[PDB]
Design a protein around this ligand. Structure first.
Ligand SMILES: Nc1ncnc2c1ncn2[C@@H]1O[C@H](COP(=O)(O)OP(=O)(O)O)[C@@H](O)[C@H]1O
Ligand SMILES: Nc1ncnc2c1ncn2[C@@H]1O[C@H](COP(=O)(O)OP(=O)(O)O)[C@@H](O)[C@H]1O
Ligand SMILES: Nc1ncnc2c1ncn2[C@@H]1O[C@H](COP(=O)(O)OP(=O)(O)O)[C@@H](O)[C@H]1O
Ligand SMILES: Nc1ncnc2c1ncn2[C@@H]1O[C@H](COP(=O)(O)OP(=O)(O)O)[C@@H](O)[C@H]1O
Ligand SMILES: Nc1ncnc2c1ncn2[C@@H]1O[C@H](COP(=O)(O)OP(=O)(O)O)[C@@H](O)[C@H]1O
Ligand SMILES: Nc1ncnc2c1ncn2[C@@H]1O[C@H](COP(=O)(O)OP(=O)(O)O)[C@@H](O)[C@H]1O
Ligand SMILES: [Mg+2]
Ligand SMILES: [Mg+2]
Ligand SMILES: [Mg+2]
Ligand SMILES: [Mg+2]
Ligand SMILES: [Mg+2]
Ligand SMILES: [Mg+2]
Lengths: 37, 282, 249, 252, 247, 249, 282
């Protein structure tokens, strides 16, 4: 789905980018989309 | 596509029912049959609609909406046909100036809202004090009068008046007042909906113009005098159809039942809209 | 055999462009009605299908083919049957200018097939419930997708991939029309916004509510109710774009 | 049209057969343009098969009618090859019109569609491989053409430019196979001819991609017997329409 | 009324002075017999003279003929590609006008594209500077402007795309005159440009596309930049012209 | 119709005017003057410097014919015939979407690979119809072993070179198809069979109706006449092909 | 009799000089001679009048009145031709509605009085403080710019500005303001002179409509936005001819010399009147 390097994949958008691990909310985030490092 | 086939039929059904509008309205003679050759002369405006053969399909939406105003109200059958046809005659102009029929409708909706909100504030509920109520009913019965036919019409109007005791003046006071309030609104709306509300107002001022064009008076002058009287605070002026001037419609005893006038406005605007949002006739 | 060949696909398209141009003025909520008038009837309806399509248009046996194929959309996949006649009309109207260049109809059909594969391959990226957001916004997120992939095709299909992009933007151009808005200006001013800020939910506000963001206006389209429009229209073009003759004894 | 007797009647029959083929040509191939033929009941029939178009078509011309009967006869017993037959027949007729406008005479054109056709079925029964199969999608009409012209070069007499026109009239099956897909025929056919000159007796038009492809390896196969029957039926239809001199329409 | 017929009696009198000079473009350019009023007929394949002696008589036709003169006094050898450009830009303006957009928008969006075109034809360039001729400076224009018309808003990103699509005419005529299939080779050229190749273009001697620049003619920028500039100036001047008045 | 077929028709007209007076035995023509002074003559070398040709294509053809005549004083009536036949076949080619340039490249290749094979027929050239009927087969074999967009313009340069043997036999009352095809059946077993390599001198006989060996009969023609005729007919066909419009002033 | 022969000529001389009005105005190409074939493209509005052969006699009253505005003022040659032709285009309508040409004149006289009395109150005399005066002159020189021809025009306008330092905004502010004041007057006059003042107002609102129709904008919408901004107290709105919206004509630095605008109004109304009171052309 989403490969993240510390981002790429089947994404049309990047809503928020944070550091936890690097977190990126890819699509409209309904808690279904959640990608970390 | 029918931007004319569905508009000239409407303005024709409301172009032959006019000239019978005011008190001194012309007549029409109904050559009906070919063998039982019958001549009946009609100063009425509803008989010329329940009798003629409607050929155009858009015209049906007016001829079958006048029955509503006639069998569910009584008086106000030639004013919701003529108002609808002079709304659909200014529509034709706006749609020829490349304005979309879906902005004219959105404009006329706010226009009829500001108009219904305008003759409501000017209604007088004299039904409380029954010494004037007796008087008012006589004015509303005189502004409504084959004999028993007209009498039944007057009875329906009077019944609606006793139910809703609010009364608004007639002869041009109500139409000119609503047109003034619609122009006062169209002077404050930014967008193409202002050319539609000004057009709505120009259509409302066509009822007194036709009431004067039927008594020989100088309508282009009396209607301007009304528009000025109704634009400098005075709100009770109106055609004095006894000497061809403008008179106080309160001291002259020319009143109409608020329900009849509001339903005339509503049915006219609704029919004009229903015939507006029609491209093709299948 | 009278009028057969590449001059029979300018008549077949003039025929399937009439049943579409009538249905082009009824898409949006601000869809202008039509009057049903036959030997007996005065119905005023703006909906689709039997209410509009299959009570008229007996001509060229091809309008009868559009109305024959649109029965598959309604009764069967919700009620999205005006968007498939307008989309088919747009695809054929672009094929009209693709044929003048000298592209064999089969080639245009393969191009539309590739472009529909790309579009349906892009709609399923925007399932957000099962659901693709947008009144006029789903057809601008795909037109942007099949325009990029167009230049990755080295054959003549590339022209058809671009004509499919240019025709997918007709749904959010009869939505701009049928209202008091300018079609090109409004369609573009929201197409340039799905790029330069990634939000495929931005679409035409047929209702003048004010926000060009169909995510919050809550105007939605079921996904299989859009995977059909993009498909049933292409499967309708590829049946009207490939028949070469109408013989009538 | 004159259509009186001799050259005029033959040209008329040839034009009628051209019309009846032109009404089916685009249907040839796996993927071919459909046809919307409507009967007298208002039914819309979309069918990309030459058999079901000739059985639903008004044949009011005699030569066209005979061609359509031979095509239906091929469709009845064999099945496959009812539009390739009429295509080959009308092309054989189209490519001898320039020679029948002079006084070449049909009796001689008939002793060119029977020697050449016998030789071509011999070549098929000699080159077929195993039930016996030959590579379709062209790759025969592009080989039988190369063989027939290379053989006609060794004919002293009038049959040289008639077999050499019989051969050239076989290139239509590998032509409209790619003219229906929209593949710029004058290039794929040039490649096929160049590739049949050197070798490649099974190289024919490919439909998945605009290029020549060895059709035997690609398993696009055609039964040798079916090809022989189609060739013989097309040649016999040609000879029939070439052997017709007048149309005696009974007055009543 | 008169505007919508004097923007289509000029765009149909300039688009008929371009389709009389079009198939004379390139090394393998078809000749064109010229029938003088006396009667003798001469044969030339250069568009300069055909425009020189043509008896145009039309306002826009003369505007386009005086464009060849300006182009050969400014760059020397562009005298039939600039006319083809400024006749296909007007072809595109014929469809952009039926849509209903105003000529003062297809005149401020061409200069919005020409200024980007200037910055596309100065990146291909090899700084000596020279640009890879043959069709590259136009397929690259089409591709890059179509990519750039997707970042533009309003009526702007509807005429810049028409600019790009009208650039694909000199490659088409060069491919036709070279004995190719124009549409197929133009699509292959665009697919070869998107993949990075910027030197591509119709090699007319071989008879097909080529990347090696040794036998791929290279031209100065001045000719291509001047062609774009003068053609955009002329189409802007023709679009903003209605009501040919007789004084 | 286009103005390329008109030029082709003009060249064909002047051909048909000259082509019945080709061989040693050939009928005459009468050239009515302005006052009416008639001159009856064969030997088209004069029929081309006296004919009233007004069409521009016929004019260019006459100019190149006279140029050839003054370069070498022979083979000027065969140049016109070969050129008009090249033009006929090139028009038939162009009328099936073969650009005149591909046909011109094909004619260049053929005229350049024909004089590189006439130098395998030279000793002088056998003459009669030998070189033509030999180049026919050689070029029909050389075309297929190339496979380019111009593989069809060399096989219409090979079947259009046998217009000289095909009009040298109607001007001898013998035949058109039979005699030329016996000629093109002897020259086949001179490029297919290596033993019968001396069958490449077998031209046709204008006295009797049967092809004879034009080396054992002394009917030679200087090589620089046949080469010049093929090289001028090619340039004439090319010059009339590269025009595609007539500009009116 | 000439109610058309002396009106269509005027609206034609002012129907070909329009579309060159605003900054982004179209051009016209003057095919002049037959032997010395000359092509000159003119974005100007005065050259198309001092060059064309005027055939209609009524048209002369406009073509020889534009010279006055051009050789005695400088700028304001296409706005007193287009304003006169859209006054004589609404005249044609009022005279087709059976209104006498001697009431239209009496109406337009009070209308131009109430208009000249309207942009006078809105003029700003920043010429006193010469730090803005330096700025204002730059705005008036930018709203006025073959090169030395336009430069001489700008010089005449600047000279008139230093003489009369009153400046009123442009781009539509002045015209829309005068039209608002004329409508506000026409809503208070009883008589047929009100249909003439409303018509005068509709003619004044035609200058910004044509300035927007020349830049591609939606004139029927921008002019309505202007009419609303100028009708709810705001008095400095106007076409922002850089992005197609309405902007504050004060912060945008688009001003015009009060004398030029007032003389445009006066000459336009005077020419319209002089061509109105003309029945026959002998
Ligand atoms: N005496 C009167 N004076 C002035 N106006 C009148 C008088 N009588 C009727 N009217 C007006 O004439 C109009 C037409 O009414 P009428 O034709 O009687 O019935 P309907 O309302 O059905 O047309 C009404 O709007 C009313 O205001
Ligand atoms: N409130 C809305 N705002 C914007 N677009 C809408 C709205 N409601 C529906 N649409 C759009 O209208 C189109 C559907 O047209 P419709 O009349 O529903 O056709 P059908 O007859 O096929 O149902 C779709 O593109 C849909 O996105
Ligand atoms: N997959 C294929 N690839 C290439 N050629 C094919 C293919 N399938 C069929 N063909 C060719 O198409 C020709 C026409 O066959 P078709 O029209 O399908 O049936 P029929 O042989 O009855 O006409 C045949 O000669 C065959 O060689
Ligand atoms: N060797 C070549 N290969 C490909 N294109 C060429 C070549 N030479 C010139 N061109 C093209 O020809 C066009 C120049 O126009 P041209 O016909 O030379 O004008 P003129 O008619 O004055 O000769 C340009 O598009 C240029 O790319
Ligand atoms: N005696 C002959 N027998 C056979 N062929 C001949 C004879 N004389 C001439 N020819 C052929 O006729 C052809 C035409 O020659 P002709 O038209 O008479 O003069 P030109 O050489 O000027 O064309 C020549 O190519 C030649 O080979
Ligand atoms: N930059 C601008 N922005 C808005 N309006 C302008 C601008 N420049 C000129 N105008 C308007 O254009 C109108 C036409 O002026 P112009 O054509 O330049 O000279 P004339 O006044 O002689 O017609 C003027 O009324 C002016 O208000
Ligand atoms: Mg009443
Ligand atoms: Mg729906
Ligand atoms: Mg089969
Ligand atoms: Mg050059
Ligand atoms: Mg000789
Ligand atoms: Mg100015």
């Amino acid at each position: 789905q989403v490969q993240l390097v510390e981002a790429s994949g089947t994404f049309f958008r990047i809503n928020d980018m944070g550091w936890y691990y690097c977190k990126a909310n890819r699509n409209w985030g309904r808690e279904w989309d959640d990608y970390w490092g | 596509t029918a931007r004319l086939t569905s508009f000239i039929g409407a303005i024709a059904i409301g172009d032959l029912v006019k000239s019978t509008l005011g008190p001194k309205g012309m007549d029409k003679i109904l050559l009906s049959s070919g063998r039982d050759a019958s001549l009946m002369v009609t100063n009425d405006g509803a008989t010329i609609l329940k009798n003629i053969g409607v050929d155009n399909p858009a015209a049906k939406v007016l001829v079958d909406m006048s029955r509503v105003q006639d069998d569910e109200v009584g008086d106000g059958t030639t004013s919701v046909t003529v108002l609808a046809a002079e709304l659909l005659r200014e529509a034709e102009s706006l749609i020829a100036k490349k304005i979309h029929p879906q902005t004219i409708i959105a404009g006329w909706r706010e226009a009829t809202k500001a108009a219904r909100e305008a003759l409501l504030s000017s209604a007088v509920d004299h039904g409380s004090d029954e010494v004037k109520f007796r008087q008012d009913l006589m004015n509303i019965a005189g502004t409504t009068l084959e004999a028993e036919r007209s009498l039944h019409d007057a009875l329906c109007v009077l019944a609606q008046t006793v139910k809703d005791s609010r009364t608004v003046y007639g002869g041009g006071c109500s139409e000119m007042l609503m047109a003034h309030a619609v122009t006062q609104l169209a002077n404050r709306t930014p967008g193409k909906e202002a050319v539609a509300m000004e057009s709505y107002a120009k259509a409302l001022r066509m009822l007194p113009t036709i009431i004067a064009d039927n008594a020989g008076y100088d309508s282009a002058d009396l209607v301007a005098q009304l528009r000025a009287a109704h634009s400098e605070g005075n709100t009770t002026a109106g055609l004095d159809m006894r000497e061809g001037t403008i008179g106080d419609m309160a001291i002259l005893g020319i009143t109409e039942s608020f329900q009849v006038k509001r339903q005339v406005l509503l049915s006219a605007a609704e029919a004009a809209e229903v015939i507006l949002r029609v491209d093709n006739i299948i | 055999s009278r009028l057969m060949g590449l001059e029979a696909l300018k008549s077949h398209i003039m025929a399937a462009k009439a049943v579409a141009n009538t249905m082009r003025t009824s898409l949006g909520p601000n869809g202008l009605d039509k009057m049903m008038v036959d030997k007996d009837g005065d119905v005023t309806v703006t909906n689709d299908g039997a209410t509009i399509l299959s009570m008229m248009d007996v001509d060229h046996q091809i309008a009868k083919l559009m109305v024959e194929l649109s029965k598959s959309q309604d009764d069967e996949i919700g009620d999205g049957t005006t968007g498939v006649v307008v989309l088919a009309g747009a695809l054929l109207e672009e094929a009209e200018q693709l044929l003048d260049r000298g592209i064999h109809p089969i080639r245009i059909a393969d191009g539309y097939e590739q472009a529909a594969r790309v579009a349906i391959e892009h709609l399923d990226k925007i399932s957000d419930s099962r659901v693709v957001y947008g009144g006029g916004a789903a057809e601008i997120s795909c037109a942007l997708a099949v325009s990029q992939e167009a230049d990755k095709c080295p054959t003549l299909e590339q022209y058809a991939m671009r004509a499919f992009a240019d025709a997918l933007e007709v749904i959010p151009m009869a939505l701009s029309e049928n209202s008091g808005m300018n079609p090109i200006q409004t369609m573009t001013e929201v197409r340039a916004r799905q790029v330069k800020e990634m939000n495929p939910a931005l679409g035409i506000d047929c209702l003048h509510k004010g926000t060009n963001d169909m995510k919050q206006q809550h105007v939605i389209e079921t996904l299989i109710g859009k995977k059909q429009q993009i498909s049933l229209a292409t499967q309708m073009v590829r049946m009207i774009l490939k028949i070469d003759d109408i013989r009538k004894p | 049209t004159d259509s009186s007797q001799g050259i005029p009647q033959l040209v008329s029959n040839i034009s009628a057969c051209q019309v009846i083929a032109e009404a089916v040509r685009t249907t040839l191939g796996p993927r071919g343009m459909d046809k919307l033929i409507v009967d007298g009941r208002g039914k819309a029939t979309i069918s990309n098969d030459g058999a079901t178009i000739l059985k639903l078509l008004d044949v009011v011309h005699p030569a066209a009618k005979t061609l359509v009967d031979i095509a239906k006869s091929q469709d009845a017993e064999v099945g496959d090859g009812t539009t390739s037959v009429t295509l080959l027949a009308a092309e054989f007729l189209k490519q001898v019109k320039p020679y029948v406008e002079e006084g070449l005479h049909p009796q001689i054109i008939i002793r060119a569609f029977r020697t050449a056709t016998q030789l071509a079925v011999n070549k098929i029964k000699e080159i077929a491989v195993t039930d016996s199969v030959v590579a379709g999608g062209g790759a025969i009409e592009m080989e039988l053409s190369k063989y027939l012209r290379d053989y006609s070069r060794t004919i002293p007499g009038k049959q040289q430019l008639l077999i050499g026109a019989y051969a050239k009239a076989l290139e239509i099956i590998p032509r409209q196979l790619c003219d229906n897909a929209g593949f710029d025929a004058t290039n794929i056919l040039n490649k096929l001819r160049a590739r049949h000159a050197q070798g490649g007796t099974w190289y024919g038009v490919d439909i998945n991609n605009e290029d020549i492809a060895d059709n035997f390896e690609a398993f696009v196969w055609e039964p040798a017997m079916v090809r022989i029957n189609a060739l013989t039926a097309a040649s016999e239809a040609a000879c029939l329409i070439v052997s017709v001199d007048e149309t005696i329409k009974n007055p009543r | 009324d008169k505007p919508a017929q004097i923007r289509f009696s000029n765009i149909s009198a300039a688009k008929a002075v371009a389709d009389a000079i079009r198939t004379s473009l390139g090394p393998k350019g078809m000749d064109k017999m010229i029938q003088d009023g006396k009667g003798d007929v001469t044969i030339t394949n250069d568009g300069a003279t055909i425009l020189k002696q043509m008896q145009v008589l039309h306002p826009a036709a003369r505007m386009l003929v005086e464009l060849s003169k300006a182009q050969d006094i400014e760059a020397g050898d562009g005298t039939t590609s600039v006319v083809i450009i400024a006749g296909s830009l007007l072809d595109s303006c014929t469809k952009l006008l039926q849509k209903g957009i105003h000529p003062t928008i297809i005149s401020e969006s061409f200069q919005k594209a020409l200024e980007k075109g200037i910055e596309i034809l100065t990146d291909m360039s090899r700084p000596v500077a020279l640009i890879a001729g043959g069709g590259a400076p136009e397929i690259e224009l089409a591709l890059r402007l179509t990519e750039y018309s997707r970042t533009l808003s309003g009526m702007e990103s509807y005429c810049v795309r028409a600019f790009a699509d009208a650039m694909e005419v000199i490659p088409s005529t060069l491919a036709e005159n070279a004995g190719l299939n124009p549409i197929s080779t133009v699509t292959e050229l665009r697919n070869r440009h998107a993949q990075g190749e910027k030197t591509a273009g119709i090699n007319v001697r071989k008879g097909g596309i080529s990347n090696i620049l040794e036998e791929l003619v290279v031209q100065p920028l001045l000719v291509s930049v001047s062609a774009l500039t003068l053609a955009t100036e002329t189409v802007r001047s023709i679009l903003k012209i209605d009501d040919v008045v007789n004084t | 119709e286009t103005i390329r077929s008109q030029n082709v028709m003009a060249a064909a007209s002047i051909a048909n005017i000259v082509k019945s007076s080709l061989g040693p035995v050939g009928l005459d023509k009468m050239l009515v003057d302005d006052i009416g002074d008639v001159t009856i003559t064969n030997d088209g070398a004069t029929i081309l410097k006296l004919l009233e040709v007004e069409h521009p294509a016929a004019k260019v053809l006459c100019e190149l014919a006279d140029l050839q005549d003054k370069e070498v004083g022979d083979g000027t009536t065969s140049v016109v015939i070969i050129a008009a036949e090249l033009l006929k076949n090139a028009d038939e080619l162009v009328k099936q979407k073969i650009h005149p340039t591909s046909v011109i490249s094909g004619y260049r290749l053929a005229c350049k690979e024909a004089v590189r094979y006439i130098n395998e027929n030279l000793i002088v050239v056998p003459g009669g119809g030998a070189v033509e009927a030999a180049l026919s087969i050689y070029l029909e074999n050389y075309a297929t072993s190339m496979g380019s967009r111009e593989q069809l313009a060399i096989a219409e340069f090979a079947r259009s070179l046998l217009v000289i043997p095909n009009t040298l036999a109607v001007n001898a009352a013998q035949d058109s198809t039979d005699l030329v095809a016996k000629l093109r059946a002897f020259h086949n077993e001179a490029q297919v069979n290596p033993e019968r390599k001396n069958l490449k001198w077998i031209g046709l006989d204008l006295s009797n109706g049967k092809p004879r060996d034009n080396k054992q009969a002394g009917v030679f023609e200087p090589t620089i006449v046949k080469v010049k005729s093929l090289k001028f007919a090619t340039e004439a066909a090319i010059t009339i092909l590269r025009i595609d419009d007539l500009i009116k002033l």
